[PDB]
Amino acid sequence: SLQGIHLSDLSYKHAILKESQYTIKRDVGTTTAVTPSSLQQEITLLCGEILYAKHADYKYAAEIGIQYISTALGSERVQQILRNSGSEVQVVLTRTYSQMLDIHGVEKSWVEEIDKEARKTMATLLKESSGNIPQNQRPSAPDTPIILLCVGALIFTKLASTIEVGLETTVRRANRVLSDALKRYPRMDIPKIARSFYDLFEQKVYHRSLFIEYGKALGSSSTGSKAESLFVNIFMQAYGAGQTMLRWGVIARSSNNIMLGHVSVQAELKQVTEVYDLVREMGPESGLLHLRQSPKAGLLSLANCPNFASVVLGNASGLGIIGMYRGRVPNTELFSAAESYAKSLKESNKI
Amino acid sequence: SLQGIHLSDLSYKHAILKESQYTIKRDVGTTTAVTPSSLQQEITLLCGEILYAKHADYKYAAEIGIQYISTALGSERVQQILRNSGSEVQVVLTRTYSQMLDIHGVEKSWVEEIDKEARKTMATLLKESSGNIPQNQRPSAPDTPIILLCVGALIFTKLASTIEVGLETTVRRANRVLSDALKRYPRMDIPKIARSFYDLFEQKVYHRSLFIEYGKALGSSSTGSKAESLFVNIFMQAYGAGQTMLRWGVIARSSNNIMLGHVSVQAELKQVTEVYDLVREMGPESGLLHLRQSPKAGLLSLANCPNFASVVLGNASGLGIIGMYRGRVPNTELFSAAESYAKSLKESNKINFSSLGLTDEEKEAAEH
RNA sequence: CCCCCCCCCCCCCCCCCCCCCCCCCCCCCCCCCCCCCCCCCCCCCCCCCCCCCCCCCCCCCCCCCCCCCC
């Protein structure tokens, strides 16, 4: 008889963020550098120069990476992407001078420093090598911009946490992942390059969705480079951004944690369901919402269900996944219980 | 046999408020300021100036915030929104003089005061800092209008209660929420800024739906600011506006409060159902109805079911949610009963091995 | 390889119909009382609350098929 007492609030909450026929025009005066497709070889060399020598400053390292993306996506197709990201920012086509590159926002002095320092290192090494430097070790190698962007991809994954946390993870993984790249360019300062990328993603927010569009575009192509196929694979491990709680939620169900049967947790079932059903309603873009720093994101918060969150985290702790997750535990009691069951489950073998 | 005795009155009540082919033209002579998109940098600076220094008067602080929304939404797209909100109010495009901003309705004297006072504070501080003030601490920082609007967002949530209640909540939450903004602009007078916003939302009612449209628009964009993503998240916690009773109603069902089974409560079932079914009939706009101060709102009243309301509130009291809710309790008897059950429920720990769907070898180990 | 026999068909008888019988046929207007409807009560609202935070390149073996007869 008592049916009909139900509000699908979360769906309506999302539905309201679609009804906006009006469009936001933020970043009214802003200008960013774009490189035409024609200058892809020149920007490739500059990328290689950053990796090849141990430089004094790695401030614009990230902007150079974005400039390669620019050449790869389109001379002027980039403006379209940026305009469509919600930012009304204007683009500036980078020119040539004497031969060098004049990148908008990038100090001419910095460009010259990077070039000068790299040539100095090439001369020192060519004397030692007895005039013999193979193609794969030169800043001219075509995969050098991809290598640069792969460091950016690693900081892109940890955009969900501290500027600091990301640098740890970036360095650790870069050692295993960019193993061979580091063999050829041992002078690449992963921490400084990764810092330039964090600074860039934080300041030029529109470059987050430009990076996503490069990833999406690269993911589509028939033939990719060995370096390119790595980039996308780093980008994929970045999909469950800020939604670590929902994925650990399915893990709690898969573990059949008896704490998910607790009366207080049972009470939150409808809210939990609503969140997972919103993911399905939003489809594929749902995952990278947090990564884009989208205001829409956060509707996928499990704040409405603290007892469920407690059990999910407990289960993760018991299975030994939790690691360094700072996520607050509302019900300490439920957490400990879920943890105990999961630890007993962990050891036990059944068919 | 006697089943055809049924009137779906509440649906018809709503249906009548759709049949209006005729449209109301209120605010016949009224004029409000709009800022063209071109002046977004100038209004950004002015917003920062409000936060940056401790000012004498924060009267027009809210109107300045609306002016940033104006630049963000559209040079002239704003007039469309206001006209479509039901208000026949006319817009006035704000100009420049010498360089300053001439905002319609905003005293030139006030604009100059805010600017003057901010420059004075910048000079005092630059002497102390030894000429070193980082970008993030200057009134020029691009997130300053968003910060200003976030104080407005907090007062927007508590538009359902007193001008007073809202200020408490705004101040409390602003301290935790705008934590870092306050670090850079410690001179921002949250209570005066929040008061300007309450006054504005109460006087210029059309600005309520303009704020909603900014929120809706911001919620849609691909890349938002850290400040922008906060604004929408404040705006979301504002969705269940004035409908606190219906949401606590679902909580009473989720708690499986045995008082919802009382014969007198059972009698009100059809009215209760009618209200929740009207929410579904109205869809997403249903929630923000009370927030818009829409005359349509109030059809979502649980006045028709006093015994149910009593149980819902009792259950909320027992679970310890009720807090500072002034909502009248018609049946004191039912309330106390629902409260007792909910308090007993609150403490009690039980396990549904029925819900989990485990093997009786996993259900075996669970008993242990 | 396949195929390999035998082999016209038909052939009787036989008109059909033929009786009887018009149908219908009674009765019968309908209507007819009472009766305005309404009548109470009722502004709604009122609490709390930014989210996020772990880890993780993938890949890595081996392999022509076919092969008779008719």
Numbering used by the authors:
A (entry chain H): 2 to 99, 112 to 364
B (entry chain G): 2 to 99, 112 to 381
From the paper:
HMPV (Paramyxoviridae, subfamily Pneumovirinae) is a leading cause of serious respiratory tract infections in children, the elderly, and immunocompromised individuals. In all members of the Mononegavirales, the RNA genome is packaged in the form of a nucleocapsid, a ribonucleoprotein complex consisting of polymerized viral nucleoproteins (N) and RNA. Besides protecting the viral genome from host nucleases, the nucleocapsid serves as the template for transcription by the viral RNA-dependent RNA polymerase L. Nucleocapsid assembly necessitates a pool of monomeric, RNA-free N, termed N0, which is kept in an unassembled state through an interaction with an N-terminal portion of the polymerase cofactor P, until delivered to the sites of viral RNA synthesis. In conclusion, the reported structures of a paramyxoviral N protein reveal two distinct conformational states, N bound either to the polymerase cofactor P or to RNA.
